[PDB]
A paper describes a structure:
To gain insight into the urease maturation process, we determined the structure of the UreG/UreF/UreH complex in its GDP-bound state to 2.35 Å resolution using X-ray crystallography. The asymmetric unit contains two copies of each of UreF, UreH, and UreG, related by 2-fold symmetry, forming a dimer of heterotrimers. The UreG/UreF/UreH complex structure represents the first known structure of UreG. The topology of UreG is characteristic of SIMIBI class GTPases containing the canonical G1 to G5 motif for guanine nucleotide recognition. Two GDP ligands are sandwiched between two UreG protomers. UreG contains an invariant Cys66-Pro67-His68 metal binding motif, substitution of which abolishes the metal binding properties of UreG. This metal binding motif is found at the dimer interface between two UreG protomers. Cys66 and His68 from each protomer are arranged in a symmetric formation that could potentially bind a metal ion at the interface. The crystal structure also showed that UreG interacts strictly with UreF only, leading to an overall structure resembling that of an inverted-T shape. Each UreG protomer makes extensive contacts with both protomers of UreF.
Author numbering:
A (entry chain C), B (entry chain A): 28 to 254
C (entry chain B), D (entry chain D): 6 to 260
E (entry chain E), F (entry chain F): 1 to 196
Amino acid sequence: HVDNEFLILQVNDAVFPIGSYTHSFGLETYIQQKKVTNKESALEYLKANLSSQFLYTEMLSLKLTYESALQQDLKKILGVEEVIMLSTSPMELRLANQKLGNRFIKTLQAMNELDMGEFFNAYAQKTKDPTHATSYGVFAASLGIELKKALRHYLYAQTSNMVINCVKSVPLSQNDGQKILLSLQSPFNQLIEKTLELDESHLCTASVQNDIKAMQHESLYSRLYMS
Amino acid sequence: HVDNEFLILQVNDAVFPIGSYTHSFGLETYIQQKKVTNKESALEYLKANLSSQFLYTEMLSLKLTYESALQQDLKKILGVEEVIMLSTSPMELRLANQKLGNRFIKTLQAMNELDMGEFFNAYAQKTKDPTHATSYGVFAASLGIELKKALRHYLYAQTSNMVINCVKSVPLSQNDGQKILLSLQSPFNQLIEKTLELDESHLCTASVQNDIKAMQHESLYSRLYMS
Amino acid sequence: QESKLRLKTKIGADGRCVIEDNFFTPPFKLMAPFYPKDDLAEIMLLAVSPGMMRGDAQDVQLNIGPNCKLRITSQSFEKIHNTEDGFASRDMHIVVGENAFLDFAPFPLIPFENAHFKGNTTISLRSSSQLLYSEIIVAGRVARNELFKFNRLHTKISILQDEKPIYYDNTILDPKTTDLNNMCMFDGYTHYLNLVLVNCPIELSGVRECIEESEGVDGAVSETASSHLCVKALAKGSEPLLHLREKIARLVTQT
Amino acid sequence: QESKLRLKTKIGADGRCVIEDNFFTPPFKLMAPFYPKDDLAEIMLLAVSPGMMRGDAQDVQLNIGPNCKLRITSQSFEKIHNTEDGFASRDMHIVVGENAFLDFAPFPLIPFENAHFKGNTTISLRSSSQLLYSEIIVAGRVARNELFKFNRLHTKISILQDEKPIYYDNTILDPKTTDLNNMCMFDGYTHYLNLVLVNCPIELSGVRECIEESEGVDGAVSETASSHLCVKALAKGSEPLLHLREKIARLVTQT
Amino acid sequence: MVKIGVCGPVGSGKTALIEALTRHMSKDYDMAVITNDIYTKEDAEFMCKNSVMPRERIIGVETGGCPHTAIREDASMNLEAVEEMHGRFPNLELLLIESGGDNLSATFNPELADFTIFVIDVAEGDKIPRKGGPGITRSDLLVINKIDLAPYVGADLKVMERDSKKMRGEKPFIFTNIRAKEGLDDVIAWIKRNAL
Amino acid sequence: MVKIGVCGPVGSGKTALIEALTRHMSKDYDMAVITNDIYTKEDAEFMCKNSVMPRERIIGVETGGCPHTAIREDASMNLEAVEEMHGRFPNLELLLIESGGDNLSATFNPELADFTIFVIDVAEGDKIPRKGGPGITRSDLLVINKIDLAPYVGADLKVMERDSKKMRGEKPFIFTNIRAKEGLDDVIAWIKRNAL
Ligand SMILES: Nc1nc2c(ncn2[C@@H]2O[C@H](COP(=O)(O)OP(=O)(O)O)[C@@H](O)[C@H]2O)c(=O)[nH]1
Ligand SMILES: Nc1nc2c(ncn2[C@@H]2O[C@H](COP(=O)(O)OP(=O)(O)O)[C@@H](O)[C@H]2O)c(=O)[nH]1
């Protein structure tokens, strides 16, 4: 009795219990170093981060495991996940996306009345290093949720959490949070179109200062976030 | 440059700053009186509450102001809002939905780059007692968002907050929260179908024990919630 | 089978609230005033019939003249039988004048299996008027364990003060569309009181106290958008609710 | 225009790391070992040419025999000219044997306007091997204020330990698809160091210290999924990066 | 019109400070309190009596058990009460907003508070100010309270002053005994000067 | 295997209690600590030394500045550390989980904690236990600490015992001085009996 139109809202719900709010993915470093001090610099950070780390690692990896799941190719899915783990150097950024992946799967599995199907269950048994984005990709294909739609909700949900981190920690007025989310709608559509275009040769395309700030996050004198 | 596909996710985001988390709409009373002690009784509470207070007051009122907004009938919209105010007896429940309505409008208006159109702006100037559901109805019609879709997102968002209240206050395991949200999908669809069927003669159909528990919430010895 | 009750009151030549004009047809039986307090008159309303049947309809008209302080107590139970493909109805229009006080409730409703009942109550007040109004609804004949076997029940209230609406109630009970036993509706209780106090000389905390003293009542009081009081209560029998209502009526009529 | 460099080393008859076999064609100029420390041999790699042009391709092959402790330092800058409708490429395969240590980096890259450059680096290690490898990329000719005018740059790294992948890098820089100056990529700096330490006798806190002592470097170190170290750093010139790299290399070769 | 938030751990003297502040200042200033630190109905009362304020000048606002969110990322109901307090008092020059009790990571949304006072006390530890949360570093004024408990708990006030000055830079902090009105004049002076 | 959460306000003695508890009990019991009360790297250290525990037996988990959510509605990272602690210690019989400091509304998700100990102290007030939050009423054991500060702050311990017994019903509470190991044996006795 499962309705995909509701299920997609449920797994992308900000309160869906994977613990996203404990992670800044390096943003906390940019803040303590006074590179994100206000609405305009926050929007700059977000555009740059989404166009680099998020597009080539998170979004593209989701598309890849979706497509492989459709052909029930478990081997290619685990290969994508190995690439991501061996390519993501900053430890707190690597561990963040892995822990979120663990939580995502454990939560789906905790719901006994949701039948994910033989392939997803097989995936869930074998996966060594799932991330939130790869496991979500397999989830959406398994349930016949349309790729473009799956991407749209996932992108919005992850971005909202980054914007809220900015609101909490800069801090910014909660209204600025909403202006930023509105400004990002053209970029969101460009990102989705780009994701559909990109082949797997672009997977895990390197960022530079983003990685460095994610590593510097380990040594902060005082901090609130796990990454 | 506004995309309604994103905007609808944005205004229904759990972190969209209207303050829903500070309100239990009477649930806190049910909990301290040991009527909701676990997953099964919580699901009972939710089914009963959604089929009474939420269906006939919240959801139906949203459909009504949507339809009136399409014809640009401001008078009928303010009439629906007057009926709700004069019909909702428990004070904390009445004030909760009003405060949430204020916050919802003030937040849309704070975003200067969103053009709501001449009619919504006229609405926002005249409205005396908007609630979250009525103002949302006018919002969706003004932007050409399809009714059935508008209802789906609104229903999910408000219900997730009630389930989280159960998780925090009973308490329940966060997994139980998710099983509940999954169990509610058939009832969600019934509720939407029902909302489309119902005419305005059903508006503010009385509940009984729900109202009484909402009133008893005022005198609790110690409490965490505003309603 | 159209039953009527019409009543008009005035301050009489002796300074007491008196019946100026009346009329009724069965089932209604109206009795003559008695005087518990100085300014307080009490008139009993009774019913002589074995209930309402398919096609039955009642029309009540109350007019309470200026300066009248009146208590109308309905001493019977209104039973709705199986109405088949028809229904039974109750319409009431109530008018309260300047500086007048009215304490009134219709007979408690006991719907039988497949009973279909509709009612409409409109009340006009003046800014200086005072009102205590209430309604009780029962689940069925609890004696024989008939709970929520009726067809459908729909009752409405509108209260206007100088032509301006200050309160509404819309009660629709249909056991086919919902389980009326659920924890948001009757919640295992069989009897429901809904009560309004408009412009009365009583504080919310005083009403709250009466409710707390009442045994076998799960009930509460709260302030309406128009700054008046509303009381709702559930019970396993009519007596705890009727007694509670007496205590509240007493708190207002001693002031 | 296929340039080659092939190098194979072994522990020599005197107990020192020596060249067993080599070969090269221009631009490459290979020099003979010198011995700063007892076990530490150093071999300089130089380049005699004005840069790479459309169609140019390099192939490098390194084989570091068992027990060799070797430092290969590339003392030139690799300049990529306008390649028009073609591209220049650099392929490197590196093999490190048992109980062997290799310190190596290719020439820093300076892409000119409309340069198109591709490179691929594969490194095979044994569980007992030790490795320090790095790459530097610069924005353009900073002297003439040419920043990110190249066509496209794509370089890749794969490091395997006993046939099992332990590290990857995929670097794609295309000024047409993004502004490489943004705060997530070059962030106003013109020079980028990426460096890996595999199985080296050094603690993360030690590496973190060198980075802090380095002036004019925005940089950092972290532990990889395979438990090795990765360092990334940005600068306004090659010298602060090259110097930082020297300090790190020193920390491992004194142990 | 000028909003000043007061946060700090439970039992640190946030309420005592606000009561003693309005006792002194309400004479010369038009002012009110919004407070999230309430459980029982008898809480809001006790604050009115101790602060010598009319009940209409103090509004309690529940947090749903989320005292951090209530002053920070969704401040909605607190902001609703602010707009309410402006409806009651058109000439209002000063508004004190008290949190529901929190930890060193507590901050106010800029929409809610124009300035922030963080309140810790000596018996929590002398190593508290070097832990360095946003409550220590970001707040416009820090208040170290219950200094009279120092010799009994073994708290080194040179240590606390050293570490505080280090963390806040030139952002002022004030040592305090609220029961003895000690330093209370300093705090009052700060508000008049800084927030005006 | 048996998880016990420890919450309470900042400075109330949560850490002191956990350190003094492991000092005594780790001898006869296989046990570990997860803690959300950390800011600086030098926090997690100081707990290992004072508690006489190896570093692998204490995991710090950051809350993102949301210490209530971290033990309650989304406990995800704490739950992740629990499963980690079970990977390190297959024979583990007791796991102490310390919150990031909080207020009287603090509760643990049942998935996270099997039992809960709430810690307040005398200097916060003697009217604290009658405020009646879920920390006072719901917790399996309440600890009232720093009783030695009582005469100096004017705290009436008959009042505190009266009000506590009223609020908790038959749910046990224990008066305590942790520095003096006073009542510490009672707490230890409770854990052995109740949580086993
Ligand atoms: N010894 C001492 N006690 C104080 C001082 N200031 C406040 N207190 C007491 O500390 C306790 C907690 O104060 P309270 O206002 O309730 O703290 P809050 O929880 O932040 O609002 C109360 O019993 C106060 O009387 C002080 O300077 N010295
Ligand atoms: N007088 C007194 N002080 C105590 C007692 N227990 C702890 N303390 C002190 O109060 C402070 C409590 O610190 P801590 O246990 O870290 O509080 P936490 O924030 O709940 O973890 C420390 O400085 C202790 O020295 C006690 O029983 N009596």
